[PDB]
Protein backbone atom coordinates (compact mmCIF):
# COMPACT_ATOMS: atom_id res chain seq x y z
CA UNK A 1 0.00 0.00 0.00
CA UNK A 2 1.56 3.26 -1.22
CA UNK A 3 -0.31 5.15 1.51
CA UNK A 4 1.88 3.31 4.07
CA UNK A 5 5.23 4.58 2.68
CA UNK A 6 5.56 7.61 4.95
CA UNK A 7 4.78 5.48 8.02
CA UNK A 8 7.65 3.15 7.05
CA UNK A 9 9.94 6.19 6.63
CA UNK A 10 8.83 7.44 10.05
CA UNK A 11 9.31 3.97 11.56
CA UNK A 12 12.72 3.44 9.96
CA UNK A 13 13.95 6.86 11.09
CA UNK A 14 12.60 6.41 14.62
CA UNK A 15 13.96 2.85 14.83
CA UNK A 16 17.65 3.72 14.69
Amino acid at each position, epitope marked *: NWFD*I*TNW*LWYI*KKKK
Partner: antibody
Amino acid sequence: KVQLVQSGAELKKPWSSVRVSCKASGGSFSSYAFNWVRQAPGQRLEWLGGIVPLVSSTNYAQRFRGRVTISADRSTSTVYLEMTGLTSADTAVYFCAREGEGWFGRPLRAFEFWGQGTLVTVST
Amino acid sequence: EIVLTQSPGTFALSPGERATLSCRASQSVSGGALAWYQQKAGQAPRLLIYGTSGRATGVPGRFSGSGSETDFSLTISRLEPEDFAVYYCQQYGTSQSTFGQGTRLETRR
Protein backbone atom coordinates in the same frame (compact mmCIF):
# COMPACT_ATOMS: atom_id res chain seq x y z
CA LYS B 1 0.39 25.93 11.03
CA VAL B 2 0.58 23.89 7.79
CA GLN B 3 -0.67 25.94 4.81
CA LEU B 4 -1.00 24.89 1.13
CA VAL B 5 -1.24 27.68 -1.45
CA GLN B 6 -2.12 26.81 -5.04
CA SER B 7 -1.66 28.68 -8.30
CA GLY B 8 -4.49 30.61 -9.95
CA ALA B 9 -7.35 29.58 -12.25
CA GLU B 10 -6.44 28.03 -15.61
CA LEU B 11 -8.17 28.18 -18.99
CA LYS B 12 -7.01 25.54 -21.49
CA LYS B 13 -8.04 24.24 -24.90
CA PRO B 14 -8.85 20.54 -25.34
CA TRP B 15 -5.81 18.25 -25.87
CA SER B 16 -3.48 20.82 -24.28
CA SER B 17 -1.72 20.36 -20.92
CA VAL B 18 -2.08 22.06 -17.51
CA ARG B 19 0.34 22.53 -14.61
CA VAL B 20 -0.94 23.44 -11.14
CA SER B 21 1.39 24.26 -8.25
CA CYS B 22 0.95 23.81 -4.50
CA LYS B 23 3.40 25.54 -2.13
CA ALA B 24 3.58 24.14 1.40
CA SER B 25 4.68 26.08 4.46
CA GLY B 26 4.60 25.67 8.21
CA GLY B 27 6.15 22.26 8.66
CA SER B 28 8.36 19.52 7.31
CA PHE B 29 7.89 18.78 3.60
CA SER B 30 9.74 15.80 2.20
CA SER B 31 8.63 12.96 4.49
CA TYR B 32 4.85 13.55 4.12
CA ALA B 33 2.50 12.41 1.35
CA PHE B 34 0.99 15.09 -0.89
CA ASN B 35 -2.10 14.24 -2.94
CA TRP B 36 -4.21 15.80 -5.67
CA VAL B 37 -8.03 15.53 -5.60
CA ARG B 38 -10.50 17.14 -8.02
CA GLN B 39 -14.20 18.00 -7.99
CA ALA B 40 -16.21 18.69 -11.11
CA PRO B 41 -18.97 21.29 -10.58
CA GLY B 42 -21.65 19.85 -8.29
CA GLN B 43 -20.01 16.40 -8.26
CA ARG B 44 -18.06 14.04 -6.00
CA LEU B 45 -14.42 14.12 -4.92
CA GLU B 46 -11.99 12.19 -7.14
CA TRP B 47 -8.45 11.27 -6.11
CA LEU B 48 -5.87 11.74 -8.91
CA GLY B 49 -2.62 10.64 -7.32
CA GLY B 50 0.11 11.55 -4.88
CA ILE B 51 3.84 11.89 -4.27
CA VAL B 52 6.20 11.32 -1.37
CA PRO B 53 9.00 13.84 -2.12
CA LEU B 54 11.81 12.33 -0.03
CA VAL B 55 11.85 9.05 -1.99
CA SER B 56 10.41 10.42 -5.28
CA SER B 57 7.55 7.90 -5.11
CA THR B 58 4.38 8.63 -7.08
CA ASN B 59 1.05 6.81 -7.22
CA TYR B 60 -1.70 7.54 -9.77
CA ALA B 61 -5.37 6.70 -10.12
CA GLN B 62 -5.63 4.03 -12.82
CA ARG B 63 -8.28 5.97 -14.76
CA PHE B 64 -5.67 8.73 -15.35
CA ARG B 65 -2.64 6.50 -15.88
CA GLY B 66 -0.30 8.25 -18.27
CA ARG B 67 -2.20 11.56 -18.34
CA VAL B 68 -1.28 12.65 -14.80
CA THR B 69 2.24 13.37 -13.54
CA ILE B 70 3.00 14.66 -10.05
CA SER B 71 6.38 16.08 -9.02
CA ALA B 72 7.95 17.95 -6.13
CA ASP B 73 10.63 20.59 -5.59
CA ARG B 74 12.11 20.14 -2.13
CA SER B 75 14.11 23.38 -2.26
CA THR B 76 10.89 25.41 -2.63
CA SER B 77 8.53 23.02 -0.76
CA THR B 78 6.27 22.92 -3.83
CA VAL B 79 4.32 20.01 -5.36
CA TYR B 80 3.05 20.13 -8.96
CA LEU B 81 0.26 18.46 -10.89
CA GLU B 82 0.66 18.07 -14.65
CA MET B 83 -2.34 16.77 -16.63
CA THR B 84 -2.22 16.21 -20.38
CA GLY B 85 -4.89 15.31 -22.91
CA LEU B 86 -7.40 17.74 -21.42
CA THR B 87 -11.07 17.62 -22.36
CA SER B 88 -14.22 19.22 -20.99
CA ALA B 89 -14.53 16.16 -18.74
CA ASP B 90 -11.49 17.57 -16.86
CA THR B 91 -13.15 20.93 -16.01
CA ALA B 92 -13.04 20.92 -12.21
CA VAL B 93 -11.63 22.48 -9.09
CA TYR B 94 -8.29 20.80 -8.37
CA PHE B 95 -7.13 20.56 -4.74
CA CYS B 96 -3.78 19.70 -3.32
CA ALA B 97 -3.90 17.95 0.03
CA ARG B 98 -1.30 16.76 2.49
CA GLU B 99 -1.64 13.96 5.02
CA GLY B 100 -2.03 14.79 8.69
CA GLU B 101 0.54 14.30 11.42
CA GLY B 102 -0.43 12.44 14.58
CA TRP B 103 1.08 11.90 17.99
CA PHE B 104 4.82 11.15 17.93
CA GLY B 105 5.00 12.62 14.41
CA ARG B 106 3.24 9.58 12.93
CA PRO B 107 1.88 10.35 9.42
CA LEU B 108 -1.90 9.90 9.35
CA ARG B 109 -2.43 9.07 5.63
CA ALA B 110 -5.86 10.76 5.58
CA PHE B 111 -5.80 14.27 4.09
CA GLU B 112 -5.78 16.83 6.92
CA PHE B 113 -4.38 19.87 5.08
CA TRP B 114 -5.93 21.24 1.88
CA GLY B 115 -5.08 23.95 -0.62
CA GLN B 116 -7.61 26.59 -1.57
CA GLY B 117 -8.44 24.90 -4.85
CA THR B 118 -7.62 25.76 -8.47
CA LEU B 119 -10.35 26.04 -11.09
CA VAL B 120 -9.30 24.48 -14.42
CA THR B 121 -11.65 25.11 -17.33
CA VAL B 122 -11.16 23.10 -20.55
CA SER B 123 -13.04 24.50 -23.54
CA THR B 124 -12.73 25.84 -27.07
CA GLU C 1 -11.22 -1.03 -7.28
CA ILE C 2 -13.01 -0.58 -3.92
CA VAL C 3 -16.36 1.11 -4.52
CA LEU C 4 -17.69 3.13 -1.57
CA THR C 5 -21.46 3.56 -1.35
CA GLN C 6 -22.79 6.16 1.04
CA SER C 7 -26.31 6.11 2.44
CA PRO C 8 -28.66 7.76 2.64
CA GLY C 9 -28.14 10.11 -0.34
CA THR C 10 -29.89 12.94 1.53
CA PHE C 11 -30.81 13.13 5.24
CA ALA C 12 -33.38 15.59 6.65
CA LEU C 13 -32.82 16.29 10.36
CA SER C 14 -32.89 19.11 12.91
CA PRO C 15 -30.36 20.48 15.42
CA GLY C 16 -30.48 18.47 18.62
CA GLU C 17 -30.99 15.16 16.79
CA ARG C 18 -28.36 12.46 16.26
CA ALA C 19 -27.18 11.75 12.71
CA THR C 20 -25.66 8.43 11.64
CA LEU C 21 -24.15 8.35 8.17
CA SER C 22 -23.02 5.11 6.59
CA CYS C 23 -20.35 4.12 4.08
CA ARG C 24 -20.24 0.59 2.68
CA ALA C 25 -17.25 -0.75 0.74
CA SER C 26 -17.50 -3.31 -2.08
CA GLN C 27 -14.69 -5.27 -0.42
CA SER C 28 -12.99 -5.14 2.97
CA VAL C 29 -10.97 -1.99 3.63
CA SER C 30 -7.52 -2.94 4.91
CA GLY C 31 -6.57 -1.96 8.46
CA GLY C 32 -9.47 0.44 9.05
CA ALA C 33 -7.92 2.92 6.58
CA LEU C 34 -11.13 4.94 6.29
CA ALA C 35 -11.62 8.69 6.71
CA TRP C 36 -14.58 11.07 6.81
CA TYR C 37 -14.64 14.63 5.43
CA GLN C 38 -17.11 17.52 5.70
CA GLN C 39 -17.65 19.93 2.81
CA LYS C 40 -19.61 23.15 2.70
CA ALA C 41 -20.57 24.96 -0.48
CA GLY C 42 -17.56 26.65 -2.05
CA GLN C 43 -15.00 25.33 0.49
CA ALA C 44 -12.30 22.70 0.54
CA PRO C 45 -13.11 19.43 2.31
CA ARG C 46 -12.34 19.29 6.02
CA LEU C 47 -11.01 16.12 7.67
CA LEU C 48 -13.19 14.92 10.56
CA ILE C 49 -12.17 11.30 11.20
CA TYR C 50 -9.14 9.24 10.18
CA GLY C 51 -8.41 5.54 10.58
CA THR C 52 -12.12 4.71 11.17
CA SER C 53 -12.36 6.32 14.61
CA GLY C 54 -9.55 8.87 15.13
CA ARG C 55 -10.86 12.39 15.65
CA ALA C 56 -8.90 14.97 13.67
CA THR C 57 -7.41 17.95 15.48
CA GLY C 58 -9.90 20.70 16.25
CA VAL C 59 -12.92 18.55 15.32
CA PRO C 60 -15.68 18.80 17.97
CA GLY C 61 -16.23 15.85 20.29
CA ARG C 62 -19.78 15.30 18.96
CA PHE C 63 -18.28 13.72 15.81
CA SER C 64 -17.31 10.05 16.05
CA GLY C 65 -16.48 7.30 13.56
CA SER C 66 -16.95 3.55 13.79
CA GLY C 67 -17.09 0.33 11.77
CA SER C 68 -14.84 -2.32 10.27
CA GLU C 69 -14.31 -4.43 7.17
CA THR C 70 -16.98 -3.27 4.68
CA ASP C 71 -19.26 -1.14 6.92
CA PHE C 72 -18.36 2.26 8.39
CA SER C 73 -20.27 4.96 10.22
CA LEU C 74 -20.02 8.65 11.06
CA THR C 75 -22.18 9.71 14.00
CA ILE C 76 -22.98 13.26 15.05
CA SER C 77 -24.29 12.80 18.57
CA ARG C 78 -26.23 16.09 18.63
CA LEU C 79 -26.42 18.21 15.48
CA GLU C 80 -25.78 21.94 15.51
CA PRO C 81 -26.92 24.31 12.73
CA GLU C 82 -23.42 24.42 11.23
CA ASP C 83 -23.36 20.64 10.78
CA PHE C 84 -25.67 20.74 7.74
CA ALA C 85 -23.24 20.03 4.90
CA VAL C 86 -22.06 17.22 2.59
CA TYR C 87 -20.03 14.35 4.09
CA TYR C 88 -17.63 12.11 2.14
CA CYS C 89 -15.99 8.87 3.13
CA GLN C 90 -12.66 7.74 1.67
CA GLN C 91 -10.66 4.52 1.79
CA TYR C 92 -6.87 4.55 1.57
CA GLY C 93 -6.20 0.93 2.60
CA THR C 94 -4.85 0.06 -0.85
CA SER C 95 -2.86 2.08 -3.36
CA GLN C 96 -5.93 3.06 -5.43
CA SER C 97 -7.78 5.37 -3.02
CA THR C 98 -11.47 6.04 -3.64
CA PHE C 99 -14.22 8.29 -2.25
CA GLY C 100 -17.89 7.71 -1.66
CA GLN C 101 -20.41 9.75 -3.59
CA GLY C 102 -21.40 11.88 -0.59
CA THR C 103 -24.29 12.24 1.85
CA ARG C 104 -25.97 15.63 2.26
CA LEU C 105 -27.56 16.63 5.57
CA GLU C 106 -30.43 19.07 5.02
CA THR C 107 -32.61 20.80 7.59
CA ARG C 108 -36.09 19.31 7.80
CA ARG C 109 -39.26 21.40 7.49
